[PDB]
Design a protein around this ligand. Structure first.
Ligand SMILES: OC[C@H]1O[C@@H](O[C@@H]2[C@@H](O)[C@H](O[C@@H]3[C@@H](O)[C@H](O[C@H]4[C@H](O)[C@@H](CO)O[C@](O)(O[C@@H]5[C@@H](O)[C@H](O)O[C@H](CO)[C@H]5O)[C@@H]4O)O[C@H](CO)[C@H]3O)O[C@H](CO)[C@H]2O)[C@H](O)[C@@H](O)[C@@H]1O
Ligand SMILES: OC[C@H]1O[C@@H](O[C@@H]2[C@@H](O)[C@H](O[C@@H]3[C@@H](O)[C@H](O[C@@H]4[C@@H](O)[C@H](O)O[C@H](CO)[C@H]4O)O[C@H](CO)[C@H]3O)O[C@H](CO)[C@H]2O)[C@H](O)[C@@H](O)[C@@H]1O
Ligand SMILES: OC[C@H]1O[C@@H](O)[C@H](O)[C@@H](O)[C@@H]1O
Ligand SMILES: [Mg+2]
Length: 392
């Protein structure tokens, strides 16, 4: 039962109904959260900090309960950030022109001064265009909105940019978020999921999109924080567009397992440990699906020559046995490398079905103390891969 280091410093969640069991389930894998509101969720307000979280209050629009916000900040001095207006460029959200959003900003600056907070700019996305931006017909444009906001907010304290995105193509997401780097402030992606343009065709597509975009954000130094939309949805995890991270109390969905398992660039796994397959530091080709296996929640799926790499901090050199939890309708071959060198091949792995699971163990593999890359390579095979375990 190896206690791993903090999996990510950037990763957060957008959700307002956490239990303590929910925070414990994500502990050490999620750093922060917000709930669109002025104080932490009632059932975790007393104890959230003891599980490693910081809570980020929000002033959703200019009519936010300032008394409630200041009272919360009086009792929670670890709070470091405050989020400004939610989608002011949407008539159905905060509904403030750039000039109005700037005119109300001093209320937030006074709170930031009083409690030593940094401020996140109002969150924007492409909009229906029903909040006017002066000087353009392109009222839908989020950069034109922020340009006008900053021009009106002369001298304002704005430490970070907030971005929402509902595109479903990872290359569109990276282009879009990258456009906000022009303002020379670290970015918080405070809501995203694949949803527009028809959205995901199935849960696996959303899991793949989440993986691609989380991995891009972990590697982009200009991204400060990100939070998936959202913890739980009213319709639930298996209904389009498959949003939920949390399932039953204190438990994750398949998508939430992917979200919480993906490591930062600098995180390193300690061993002996079981490591979820979806916690790879690097994936080439591998895709994601839910699994019906008796443990675990998500699986990687190979169809050809896919590669997954896991970066290890081996504190005790020695001979470790590698177990893989696998499903394979035909014969699968899987090559295992350490720092690029072949140490073992699983040969003719066959379970008889895509959700017929077995655990397969290697011979002992010599690992010296230090940093190593464990590489799991499909050799022209079709299989599912739930988790791995290194034992000594
Ligand atoms: O239900 C209301 C709801 O609205 C939310 O805000 C929406 C907002 O999300 C929406 O944004 C669209 C956006 O999805 C669209 O993305 C484009 C990219 O601009 C484009 C740039 O390269 O890439 C994409 O992916 O197109 C290419 C693919 O078609 C193709 O396959 O090739 C590439 C992939 O290989 C892709 O690049 C995307 O399609 O962009 C348009 C503008 O161009 C945005 O409008 O816009 C809505 C209004 O029109 C908003 O309402 C809001 O957050 C939420 O609160 C609210 O509830
Ligand atoms: O500050 C005072 C104002 O309080 C307003 O009540 C807010 C309430 O609106 C807020 O609801 C949020 C939604 O804003 C959020 O909508 C999503 C968008 O943020 C996003 O961009 O798009 C998605 C679509 O994909 C929207 O669903 O969704 C979350 C989660 O469902 C809601 O919690 O919540 C605040 C905290 O509870 C609450 O204060 C009120 O409407 C104003 O009249 C009032 O002035
Ligand atoms: O001109 C109409 C504009 O409407 C907006 O809602 C869209 O996001 C733009 O892509 C489009 O060009
Ligand atoms: Mg798994």
């Amino acid at each position: 039962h190896m206690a791993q280091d903090m999996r990510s410093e950037k990763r957060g969640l957008a959700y307002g109904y956490h239990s303590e069991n929910d925070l414990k389930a994500m502990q050490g894998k999620v750093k922060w959260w917000y709930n669109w509101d002025t104080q932490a969720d009632a059932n975790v307000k007393e104890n959230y900090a003891s599980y490693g979280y910081d809570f980020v209050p929000m002033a959703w629009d200019e009519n936010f309960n300032e008394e409630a916000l200041r009272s919360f900040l009086d009792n929670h001095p670890d709070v470091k950030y405050l989020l400004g207006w939610n989608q002011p460029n949407f008539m159905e959200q905060a509904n403030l022109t750039p000039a109005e959003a700037a005119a109300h900003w001093p209320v937030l600056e006074a709170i930031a001064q009083d409690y030593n907070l940094k401020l996140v700019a109002p969150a924007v996305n492409y909009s229906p265009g029903n909040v006017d931006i002066p000087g353009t017909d392109d009222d839908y444009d989020p950069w034109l909105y922020l340009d006008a906001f900053f021009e009106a907010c002369e001298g304002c304290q704005v430490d970070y940019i907030a971005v929402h995105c509902y595109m479903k193509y990872e290359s569109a997401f990276s282009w879009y978020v990258g456009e906000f780097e022009r303002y020379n402030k670290p970015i918080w992606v405070t809501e995203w999921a694949g949803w527009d343009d028809g959205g995901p065709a199935n849960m696996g597509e959303q899991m793949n999109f989440l993986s691609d975009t989380v991995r891009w954000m972990e590697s982009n130094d200009n991204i400060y924080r990100y939070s998936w939309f959202l913890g739980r949805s009213s319709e639930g995890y298996d209904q389009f567009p498959y949003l939920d991270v949390l399932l039953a109390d204190g438990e994750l969905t398949p998508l939430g397992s992917v979200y919480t398992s993906i490591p930062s660039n600098d995180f390193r796994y300690k061993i002996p440990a079981r490591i979820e397959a979806e916690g790879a530091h690097s994936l080439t080709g591998f895709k994601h699906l839910a699994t019906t296996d008796t443990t675990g929640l998500a699986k990687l799926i190979a169809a050809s020559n896919e590669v997954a790499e896991y970066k290890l901090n081996v504190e005790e050199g020695g001979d470790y046995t590698l177990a893989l939890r696998l499903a394979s309708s035909a014969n699968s071959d899987i090559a295992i490398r350490v720092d690029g060198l072949l140490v073992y091949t699983f040969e003719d792995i066959n379970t008889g079905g895509v959700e017929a699971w077995m655990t397969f163990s290697s011979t002992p593999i010599s690992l010296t103390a230090g940093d190593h890359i464990l590489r799991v390579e499909s050799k022209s095979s079709r299989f599912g891969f739930n988790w791995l375990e290194l034992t000594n």
